[PDB]
Ligand binder design. Sequence first.
Ligand SMILES: Nc1nc2c(ncn2[C@@H]2O[C@H](COP(=O)(O)OP(=O)(O)O)[C@@H](O)[C@H]2O)c(=O)[nH]1
Ligand SMILES: Nc1nc2c(ncn2[C@@H]2O[C@H](COP(=O)(O)OP(=O)(O)O)[C@@H](O)[C@H]2O)c(=O)[nH]1
Ligand SMILES: *NCCOP(=O)(O)OC[C@H](O)CO
Ligand SMILES: *NCCOP(=O)(O)OC[C@H](O)CO
Ligand SMILES: *NCCOP(=O)(O)OC[C@H](O)CO
Lengths: 458, 450
Amino acid sequence: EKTHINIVVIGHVDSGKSTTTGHLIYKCGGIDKRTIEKFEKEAAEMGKGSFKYAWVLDKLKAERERGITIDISLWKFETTKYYITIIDAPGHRDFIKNMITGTSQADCAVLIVAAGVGEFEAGISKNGQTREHALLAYTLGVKQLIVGVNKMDSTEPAYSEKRYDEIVKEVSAYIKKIGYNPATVPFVPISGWHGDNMLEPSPNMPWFKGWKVERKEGNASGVSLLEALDTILPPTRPTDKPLRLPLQDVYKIGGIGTVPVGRVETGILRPGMVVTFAPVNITTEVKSVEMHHEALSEALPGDNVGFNVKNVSVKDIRRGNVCGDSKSDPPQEAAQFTSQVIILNHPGQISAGYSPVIDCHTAHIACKFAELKEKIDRRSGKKLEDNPKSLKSGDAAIVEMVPGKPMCVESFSQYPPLGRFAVRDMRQTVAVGVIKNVEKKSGGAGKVTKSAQKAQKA
Amino acid sequence: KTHINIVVIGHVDSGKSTTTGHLIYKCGGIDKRTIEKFEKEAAEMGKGSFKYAWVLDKLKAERERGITIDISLWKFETTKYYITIIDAPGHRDFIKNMITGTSQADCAVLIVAAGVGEFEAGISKNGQTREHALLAYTLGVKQLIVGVNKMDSTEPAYSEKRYDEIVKEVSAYIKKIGYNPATVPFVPISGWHGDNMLEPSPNMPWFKGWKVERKEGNASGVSLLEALDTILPPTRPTDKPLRLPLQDVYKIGGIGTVPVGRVETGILRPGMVVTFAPVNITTEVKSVEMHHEALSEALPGDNVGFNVKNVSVKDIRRGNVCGDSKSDPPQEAAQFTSQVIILNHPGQISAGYSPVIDCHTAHIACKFAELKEKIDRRSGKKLEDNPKSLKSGDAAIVEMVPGKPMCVESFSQYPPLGRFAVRDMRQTVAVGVIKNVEKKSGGAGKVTKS
Ligand SMILES: Nc1nc2c(ncn2[C@@H]2O[C@H](COP(=O)(O)OP(=O)(O)O)[C@@H](O)[C@H]2O)c(=O)[nH]1
Ligand SMILES: Nc1nc2c(ncn2[C@@H]2O[C@H](COP(=O)(O)OP(=O)(O)O)[C@@H](O)[C@H]2O)c(=O)[nH]1
Ligand SMILES: *NCCOP(=O)(O)OC[C@H](O)CO
Ligand SMILES: *NCCOP(=O)(O)OC[C@H](O)CO
Ligand SMILES: *NCCOP(=O)(O)OC[C@H](O)CO
């Protein structure tokens, strides 16, 4: 009955991700006591770990690898308004692959940050993953973020407010440059080990009056980490976004005219709009829309609809073109885009200049790997090398890409269905990525149909 | 209209890609200018047949590694269904995709070549046609259409005698496998020329039609397209017997013993007399609750708690399966045959390997008692009967025997209780689906005061 919410837990190594997640699983009662003792005993019989709470996240990472998920109810807990599943975490081989491919899709990210002397400054430095994980979460469109300032018991003095305020000020400034509004992000001081302020206020922090978030969708306030999880906003239906309609096919139909066919990915398409076709840059009014050969009054996201457009021939638009309205951020041609990729099994060496085909939404266009900007570690997202010379299997990377033919692609944080792509080479998928930013082409006003000229004159 | 998923199987080079592509051509699923763009791309790569075949060759290639970008090219429309091709043999991840259920076919189109040229006309005892049909039966694809292809190349052309020979030979095999041959339409086609795919072929006036006789009702037709419109919807989980794997068991004061779990099939009603397997306990359900609020019915998909009478918390655990005591009650598995694919891991697997099995909410070590067949994961063909070992990348038929009492189900009867993962320490070393289960010779045990 309650809505389902997926959580990913991020943060620098040894910041307390495992301890905090497992303690949350213990305290929220999704696992009975006998089952916990069975799994604590099994972890000890493996020799490894035997820390408290540790087996929970180590078991999750191991079961998020190649293969299936058989049951995930061990990492699902219930709050007052949400079923919440811990879907993934960094520190295992297929982490970045799951994030990029979207097999692990998160509605919110819990960023753990350690508060001990040295621990915080290490994760927030250039060598640390706090900023890298935050940027990765933003790159994937996880635009809800909870920051748990962990290990408050180990500050000097213990449970230090001065320390907590310092961490909030510096993390806020960094996530602000990344793209987050730090006024929407709750900062919860906690102790994953002892449990302080996870399910209820901690007697050890009477100075903490609570966190607050401001947002157009309604302000919220609370004290515990669990309260912060209840302020997660549901999956934003893309009806609010501008129109994006990648064309699947374009038919000519006797009597009617030209009718492209596609799934509406963002926004609404209703008859009478003055749409713009990228990357060809044509602009027309749509005469009608039809779904399942019956006419529709408006086409919300998800519908496979064909639509009748005026004065445009079939040789003028193709499968792979993107359709959006000219009233609300019309799609432009992509001049180049940077993206984050994961290199899949492929014995060869990818160098700069490697030109493969790029399946992106309904488009299918050869691109050039112009630069290899960064070499990323796939187990954690950690940056390994600036401007690498080549990439091999199992590597992740940031690359700039220039298409060899006109192409319309979007940033994945903005329009997800147009920002995830596959890299194919003959009958082999060699890489998959998500688009970081796309520098749009100069262009200008495209050729406007007689029908579109009449609409924009009343 | 209903959405329907199709898997296309058959021996290599029997004409799966040509038949499928020609069907997608003739059903207007793709515009003509896009068809030409991809036919020219296909000829440049030079790895597959230049016309028609690129459609299924593209699909095979894009069902790889775990990334799906767009499937619009493989969804065509018949008069009763939106049909989608999801997979076909001939790529590394075929068997893995079938088992892991990232491809869930409603019906299997089996393609058999009638024109065998100077090769072996016989459908061999250990051949790909039989092994593919055995695979579809293991994965619960209980609807099967046989396209007898390349009728243009028989001796003589469009030979009724050759067509009969093949139906007789194939019917015997699929009847042994477990299909009722009376329910399988046999359509003589030419995927290349388009004979008998959407309309009757003038080259086969002897073919008066195929006939199916099912428990639901008979149907007849001529073309392969009409065969696709006799596919039935799957059995909704609501109409199957109750199956409820227990996630947790709690002791609530006053209330008593409250198991919690997800209804996978059937309906859970307060007042039902359920049986817990494999502990063989039968008792009445006093109430059913969802979100600390009562419930008339617990439907498939609901995560519920239910209070049972006269049952101790020491008596039922996570991993036990709950079901109706009257309609198909669950029982303890004495042993079960399964189909697995081995993932990378150190060393080889012999008979006697006793790893942990992850099935529904259970977590129990099982013995690989017999390794029965070694299967290639690309083509799905049989490499070896009774192999001495399995290595990474292999696919196999194995007979498993649980070490502690376990309750599992055939994947075709109860899918959520029929697929499993195999773990060694923390590594995932195999995934599989259950063919058939030998239930324990144990009769009704503890029946409480209700
Ligand atoms: N004092 C203290 N130690 C903690 C706390 N949370 C975790 N630790 C410890 O810090 C280390 C970090 O371990 P872990 O939770 O596995 O970190 P991960 O690498 O981010 O998953 C372990 O030794 C934990 O026991 C905390 O709140 N307070
Ligand atoms: N003569 C004839 N050749 C066919 C027919 N269908 C397919 N072929 C050819 O048989 C070969 C194998 O077909 P393909 O579709 O690639 O087979 P698959 O390996 O099962 O996908 C190709 O050369 C096709 O052109 C048919 O009906 N008649
Ligand atoms: N990817 C090209 C490497 O050189 P860089 O300077 O970083 O890229 C800009 C191009 O040189 C433009 O001419
Ligand atoms: N408990 C019945 C209320 O739900 P409903 O949808 O009506 O289920 C009825 C059966 O599924 C009908 O077969
Ligand atoms: N799996 C080897 C054990 O001996 P085997 O003869 O193959 O199996 C015995 C049957 O299960 C009972 O007849």
